[PDB]
Amino acid sequence: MATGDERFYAEHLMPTLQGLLDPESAHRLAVRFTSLGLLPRARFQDSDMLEVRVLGHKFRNPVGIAAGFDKHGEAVDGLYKMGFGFVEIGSVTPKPQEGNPRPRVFRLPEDQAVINRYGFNSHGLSVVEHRLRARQQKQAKLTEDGLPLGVNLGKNKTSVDAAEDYAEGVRVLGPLADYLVVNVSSPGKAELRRLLTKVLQERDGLRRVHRPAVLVKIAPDLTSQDKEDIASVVKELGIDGLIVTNTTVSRPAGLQGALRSETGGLSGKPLRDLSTQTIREMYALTQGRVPIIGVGGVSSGQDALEKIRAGASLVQLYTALTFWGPPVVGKVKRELEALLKEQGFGGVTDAIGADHRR
Ligand SMILES: Cc1cc2nc3c(=O)[nH]c(=O)nc-3n(C[C@H](O)[C@H](O)[C@H](O)COP(=O)(O)O)c2cc1C
Ligand SMILES: Cc1c(-c2ccc(-c3ccccc3F)cc2)nc2ccc(Cl)cc2c1C(=O)O
Ligand SMILES: CCCCCCCCCC[N+](C)(C)[O-]
Numbered sequence: 552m553a554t555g556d557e558r559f560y561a562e563h564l565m566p567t568l569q570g571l572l573d574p575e576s577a578h579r580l581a582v583r584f585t586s587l588g589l590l591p592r593a594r595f596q597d598s599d600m601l602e603v604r605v606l607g608h609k610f611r612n613p614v615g616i617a618a619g620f621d622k623h624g625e626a627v628d629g630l631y632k633m634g635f636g637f638v639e640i641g642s643v644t645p646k647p648q649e650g651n652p653r654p655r656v657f658r659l660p661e662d663q664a665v666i667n668r669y670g671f672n673s674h675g676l677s678v679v680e681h682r683l684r685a686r687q688q689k690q691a692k693l694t695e696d697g698l699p700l701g702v703n704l705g706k707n708k709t710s711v712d713a714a715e716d717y718a719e720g721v722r723v724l725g726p727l728a729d730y731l732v733v734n735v736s737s738p739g740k741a742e743l744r745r746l747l748t749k750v751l752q753e754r755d756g757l758r759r760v761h762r763p764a765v766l767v768k769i770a771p772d773l774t775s776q777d778k779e780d781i782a783s784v785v786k787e788l789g790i791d792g793l794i795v796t797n798t799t800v801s802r803p804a805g806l807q808g809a810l811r812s813e814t815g816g817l818s819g820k821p822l823r824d825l826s827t828q829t830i831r832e833m834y835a836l837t838q839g840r841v842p843i844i845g846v847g848g849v850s851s852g853q854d855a856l857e858k859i860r861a862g863a864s865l866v867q868l869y870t871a872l873t874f875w876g877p878p879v880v881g882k883v884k885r886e887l888e889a890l891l892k893e894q895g896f897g898g899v900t901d902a903i904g905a906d907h908r909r
């Protein structure tokens with residue numbers, strides 16, 4: 552057990568844990584350990600180079616934990632201790648729901664990938680609300696210290712009115728979040744405008760200290776038309792940002808994992824460049840004026856900086872954590888800082904969208 556060390560986790564601890572446990576058991580255990588603060592390190596001290604000011608907030612470093620690891624808001628503080636510059640919880644649905652039957656997550660070790668069809672298993676808004684209320688002032692200090700909190704909002708499976716599910720989440724969790732996320736993406740145009748109009752009106756109805764940024768999270772499987780439409784609505788309505796991307800329902804040629812034909816969203820290395828390209832396109836479509844959080848197959852500084860250069864102001868990872876473990880956070884940050892220096896950027900901020908100016 553005990554402490555590391557990137558090599559010890561990646562070469563020994565994590566693979567052993569994967570050989571003993573199915574992915575959902577290891578996920579639950581990870582959330583357990585993290586929430587108790589049973590973490591190695593973190594020996595990495597964030598430099599001013601890594602600091603980003605975006606979405607009305609200061610981010611100590613641009614490396615966050617993506618939605619889906621901490622679905623129910625149970626490990627937020629342990630995730631900050633892990634070295635993440637921001638935490639996104641969820642997706643959270645209005646009512647509790649169990650999600651899909653098990654097994655519903657599948658490891659593709661040869662591809663450094665996962666396929667998941669959790670189906671939005673959620674403790675629901677009420678349980679999450681109280682859990683965030685119990686630490687609300689602690690979070691206010693973390694946020695002020697440059698460690699913001701995002702809440703990803705979902706909808707119930709049997710929901711009659713999608714927009715109202717999101718509106719409810721906005722009202723309930725919005726006062727507790729630095730930013731909110733609406734998935735247009737889990738595996739309109741006038742309909743999308745309709746939904747996002749409602750979400751933004753609900754957000755604007757909150758008291759001034761309790762007003763989060765609103766971001767839209769997209770899949771990497773959208774047509775060119777979908778992406779044009781989204782960009783257009785985002786700019787018309789003044790959506791605060793985009794998260795790019797969710798998992799893919801595509802199966803790129805070359806996947807080796809025996810489980811590659813499982814239904815669900817694919818994450819990790821095979822998603823990486825598909826996601827970066829979507830960032831590139833969404834940045835150009837929004838004239839570099841809409842903050843993007845880049846997510847999809849990030850496990851190194853190069854991965855992170857490619858997304859930043861492509862137009863991301865911030866990045867997230869998830870699947871890398873499942874293979875490398877907690878030390879992956881400091882690894883990405885250390886490598887990113889070294890790459891920024893090597894490439895003559897003063898900091899992360901100078902690198903945002905740098906490819907578009909070549
Ligand atoms: C186990 C699993 C569950 C996920 N659950 C959610 C979810 O609840 N809501 C969401 O927006 N994204 C969810 N995601 C997608 C991730 O947030 C992220 O967009 C995607 O995995 C790409 O990042 P990655 O390659 O670093 O994993 C999930 C991903 C995985 C691996
Ligand atoms: C190992 C692991 C892990 C995982 C991640 C982090 C840790 C960990 C956390 C706190 C301290 C020490 C640790 F090793 C343990 C285990 N998480 C997952 C999350 C979601 C899914 Cl689908 C799979 C996993 C897996 C896995 O591949 O089994
Ligand atoms: C989920 C398996 C986690 C096993 C790793 C245990 C973390 C080491 C704890 C380090 N420390 C002594 C500081 O608590």
Ligand SMILES: O=C(O)c1cc(=O)[nH]c(=O)[nH]1
Pocket residue numbers: 619642667668669670671672734736737738797798816
């Ligand atoms: O809960 C899930 O099944 C899920 C949600 C989501 O937004 N993305 C994903 O890959 N899985």
